């Protein structure tokens, strides 16, 4: 009926929305509300069939490689286990969370919400986790990674498609078509019912958790979810500054130390990211270009964009306001793709595992690269555009 924009503080009346209809802010044109879509039972069935399909998708080999007269089969679990046995437990854990853990947590959340419907247990942090978890479900990125790796090692040996590749493709398609219709405010309004306002109050705040507009109670908590309600974020500037500085500091050991070590006939290569991308540009520049633009262009772009945004917040510049928001949206959209390098090196070290002729191993630099990617993603997510809009 009447709401307030969560990114520029625009209080506007909300007309009724149909299935194909969509609502946007009149000022900054940001997505605000939806509805209708699918039902909870369809999502539960999708979660159930994902639970059925996942173990036979991860367990079965992705592709067979015939190297030096020896047939080698590999999958995700073997690569993660070899990463852990090497010693880099943190890199293996973050790869596990990015690839394997997220669908499991999604299925668990849907099942627990269904059991809360059946029983009546509290579901307050579960909805917040469900809303924030759509960013980390990166299965199509892993599909692009295995395609890039298959192109990369096509010349070295003979590659044949595995049985589990079809199941993995089916799982990816199912996750994509399920996440494309998962609505959170519909769940919030179905489980917890509220009432609209008088269309003109000039005192309604926006909850950063559930996008709800309403007066705070005597405890200062949101009437829909048990978190405090404030005008802006608490320490967004300080947290953003600390995370950006941490990412900038951790960038240097990621780029200087070697990332991949290739023992070739008893001799190791020990080349860094720059040497690897130079060799890839020399050999297979067609894929080296997309690797370069999706591996080292995105992190530096995000770092400089965040630094310029912080300097504009300090400087109170009002010259490029119409473009800073679009740059922030593009950075938020593009920060997810930066995890391609870890997937590629994981698959290559899982595939090329000859005893002494060819030994592909991960060096002590991917940990810093993954830490920098996570820190810059959190720095981008932690910032608020309302500080920029109020900087005028």
């Amino acid at each position: 009926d009447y709401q307030r924009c969560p990114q520029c503080d625009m209080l506007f009346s909300l007309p009724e929305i149909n299935s194909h209809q969509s609502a946007y802010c009149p000022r900054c044109q940001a997505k605000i509300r939806d509805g209708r879509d699918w039902s909870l039972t369809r999502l539960a069935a999708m979660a159930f069939t994902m639970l059925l399909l996942m173990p036979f998708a991860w367990g079965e080999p992705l592709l067979h490689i015939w190297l030096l007269g020896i047939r080698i089969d590999a999958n995700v679990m073997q690569g993660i286990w070899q990463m852990t046995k090497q010693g880099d437990a943190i890199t293996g854990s973050m790869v596990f969370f990015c690839v394997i853990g997220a669908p499991l947590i999604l299925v668990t959340s849907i099942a627990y919400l269904w059991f809360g419907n059946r029983l009546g247990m509290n579901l307050r942090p579960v909805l917040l986790m469900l809303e924030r978890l759509k960013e980390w479900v990166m299965l199509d990125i892993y599909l692009v990674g295995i395609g890039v790796a298959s192109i990369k090692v096509q010349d070295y040996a003979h590659i044949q498609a595995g049985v589990g590749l079809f199941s993995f493709v089916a799982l990816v398609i199912l996750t994509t078509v399920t996440l494309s219709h998962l609505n959170v405010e519909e769940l919030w309004e179905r489980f917890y019912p509220q009432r609209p306002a008088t269309r003109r109050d000039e005192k309604l705040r926006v909850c950063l958790g559930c996008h709800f507009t309403g007066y705070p109670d005597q405890r200062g908590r949101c009437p829909r979810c048990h978190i405090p309600l404030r005008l802006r974020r608490r320490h967004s500037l300080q947290k953003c500054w600390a995370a950006l500085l941490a990412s900038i500091v951790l960038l240097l050991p990621a780029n200087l130390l070697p990332i991949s070590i290739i023992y070739l006939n008893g001799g190791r290569q020990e080349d860094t990211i720059l040497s690897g991308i130079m060799s890839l540009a020399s050999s297979n520049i067609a894929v080296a270009g997309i690797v370069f633009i999706a591996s080292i262009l995105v992190p530096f772009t995000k770092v400089i964009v965040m630094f310029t945004l912080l300097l504009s917040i300090h400087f109170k510049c009002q010259q490029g306001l119409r473009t800073r928001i679009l740059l922030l949206r593009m950075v938020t959209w593009i920060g997810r793709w930066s995890m391609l390098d870890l997937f590629v090196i994981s698959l290559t070290m899982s595939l090329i595992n000859r005893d002494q002729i060819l030994a592909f191993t991960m060096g002590p630099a991917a940990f810093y690269f993954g830490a920098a990617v996570i820190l810059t993603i959190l720095a981008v997510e932690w910032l608020d555009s309302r500080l920029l809009w109020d900087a005028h």
């Binding site: 370069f292 633009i293 262009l297 530096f300 772009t301």
Partner: peptide, 28 residues
């Protein structure tokens, strides 16, 4: 900006190539 970073990388590659350009000699 992506084009600025691409131009910087191209300039760095050109400088690296020109640092050891040397003299060209023809051998039969």
């Amino acid at each position: 900006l992506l084009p600025f970073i691409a131009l910087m990388i191209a300039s760095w590659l050109i400088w690296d190539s020109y640092q050891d350009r040397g003299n060209t000699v023809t051998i039969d």
